Enzyme design. Structure first.
Site, PDB file in Angstrom:
ATOM      1  N   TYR A   1      -2.783   0.872  12.156  1.00 25.17           N
ATOM      2  CA  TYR A   1      -3.304  -0.474  11.962  1.00 25.17           C
ATOM      3  C   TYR A   1      -3.940  -0.987  13.251  1.00 25.17           C
ATOM      4  CZ  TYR A   1      -1.068  -0.536   7.303  1.00 25.17           C
ATOM      5  OH  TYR A   1      -0.816  -0.195   5.985  1.00 25.17           O
TER       6      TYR A   1
ATOM      7  N   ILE B   1       0.896  -1.174   0.000  1.00 26.81           N
ATOM      8  CA  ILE B   1       0.000   0.000   0.000  1.00 26.81           C
ATOM      9  C   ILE B   1       0.911   1.192   0.000  1.00 26.81           C
ATOM     10  CG2 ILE B   1      -0.135  -0.025   2.539  1.00 26.81           C
ATOM     11  CD1 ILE B   1      -3.124   0.959   2.188  1.00 26.81           C
ATOM     12  N   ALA B   2       0.472   2.260  -0.701  1.00 28.85           N
ATOM     13  CA  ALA B   2       1.233   3.521  -0.736  1.00 28.85           C
ATOM     14  C   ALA B   2       0.290   4.670  -0.948  1.00 28.85           C
ATOM     15  CB  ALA B   2       2.306   3.549  -1.833  1.00 28.85           C
TER      16      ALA B   2
ATOM     17  N   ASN C   1       8.244   1.714  11.502  1.00 26.61           N
ATOM     18  CA  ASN C   1       7.102   2.536  11.108  1.00 26.61           C
ATOM     19  C   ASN C   1       6.059   2.534  12.221  1.00 26.61           C
ATOM     20  OD1 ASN C   1       5.083   4.045   9.818  1.00 26.61           O
ATOM     21  ND2 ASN C   1       5.513   3.071   7.831  1.00 26.61           N
TER      22      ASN C   1
ATOM     23  N   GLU D   1       2.373  -7.069   6.518  1.00 33.32           N
ATOM     24  CA  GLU D   1       3.701  -7.035   7.092  1.00 33.32           C
ATOM     25  C   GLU D   1       4.170  -5.576   7.085  1.00 33.32           C
ATOM     26  OE1 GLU D   1       6.329  -9.573   4.793  1.00 33.32           O
ATOM     27  OE2 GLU D   1       6.423 -10.941   6.476  1.00 33.32           O
TER      28      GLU D   1
END
Length: 156
Positions: free
Chosen positions: A115, A69-70, A108, A103
């Site tokens: 999350y 994801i970005a 981060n 993952e």
């Protein structure tokens, strides 16, 4: 104005462009091409006509795994990553998918916190899984339960 839709093959060049801008250890074009097709449920979020974020997810039976994801750096702190994850989660729930896995690099802390707020739990750690610019860092594997079972108790 933001719109979420399927990420198609002809959208992969725009996703690759985001990946170069967003990630220090970017995916190659061949990796993007590899991560599509009938097991994938890939999404893009567009803001005012431009792709702003994407999420690549493989669904195998009733289990989904987020491969990448970005969010484009011009679009940070605008809620777009959440919006896109919430959309994915909702669609997976509609399909009866049991879990979503991902993952994340241990450094981060901000993404981990996000999350957790969405319901993800740390499942396990992979020591020194990822390269860094200095040496190596852990991967955190996270899991989100989505759908409930429905058979319940049996009577005859």
């Amino acid at each position: 104005m933001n719109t979420i839709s399927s990420l198609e093959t002809t959208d992969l060049p725009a996703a690759y462009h985001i990946e170069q801008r967003a990630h220090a250890f970017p995916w190659s074009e061949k990796t993007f091409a590899s991560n599509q097709g009938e097991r994938y449920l890939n999404f893009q979020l567009t803001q005012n006509g431009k792709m702003a974020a994407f999420a690549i997810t493989q669904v195998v039976l009733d289990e989904a795994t987020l491969f990448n994801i970005a969010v484009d750096p011009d679009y940070q702190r605008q809620g777009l990553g959440r919006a896109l994850l919430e959309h994915l989660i909702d669609e997976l729930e509609k399909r009866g998918v049991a879990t979503l896995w991902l993952e994340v690099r241990a450094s981060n802390a901000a993404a981990i916190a996000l999350y957790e707020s969405l319901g993800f739990n740390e499942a396990t750690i992979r020591r020194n899984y990822y390269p860094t610019t200095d040496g190596r860092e852990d991967a955190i594997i996270m899991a989100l339960p989505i759908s409930m079972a429905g058979e319940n108790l049996y009577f005859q």
